[PDB]
């Protein structure tokens, strides 16, 4: 069961392949057409694209957030 969850994310990043500026390479901007958001400023753009991009993240295990319908 849960390997196929990992296996789906292998294909998910493979869907996110094929392109000039790889999406994890750069930071998303802020809302002012200027520099970047805080978690892409405080940490690398490869991770930020994981806690919102790969999946929207929750803080704890006790709080269930977004369903990630396209990841479904």
């Amino acid at each position: 069961l849960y390997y196929n969850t990992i296996i789906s994310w292998i294909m998910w990043y493979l869907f996110n392949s094929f392109q000039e500026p790889l999406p994890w390479s750069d930071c998303p901007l802020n809302e002012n057409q200027t520099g970047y958001v805080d978690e892409c400023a405080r940490s690398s753009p490869v991770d930020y694209f994981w806690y919102r991009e790969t999946l929207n993240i929750s803080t704890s295990i006790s709080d269930s957030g977004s369903i990630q319908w396209w990841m479904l």
Binding site: Q19, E20, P21, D26, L29, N32, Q33, T34
Partner: protein, 68 residues
């Protein structure tokens, strides 16, 4: 006006009035004046705005829209 010429291509500058030299140009308008034609001068010396440093003026551009 050119002051403190450094062989390292660095110097503090300001501009005046042409020959009403009793009065100078206020810097607050020069800051927006550079940001209008900032793109004009880097290719005037084959530069990249990381070789056009101004210390108070920085490029605020570049939103990408690659996917349809």
């Amino acid at each position: 006006r050119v002051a403190n010429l450094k062989p390292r291509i660095s110097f503090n500058f300001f501009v005046t009035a042409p020959k009403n030299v009793s009065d100078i140009i206020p810097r607050t308008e020069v800051e927006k004046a550079i940001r209008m034609s900032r793109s004009r001068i880097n290719d005037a010396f084959r530069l990249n705005d990381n070789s056009l440093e101004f210390l108070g003026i920085q490029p605020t551009l570049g939103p990408p829209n690659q996917p349809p």
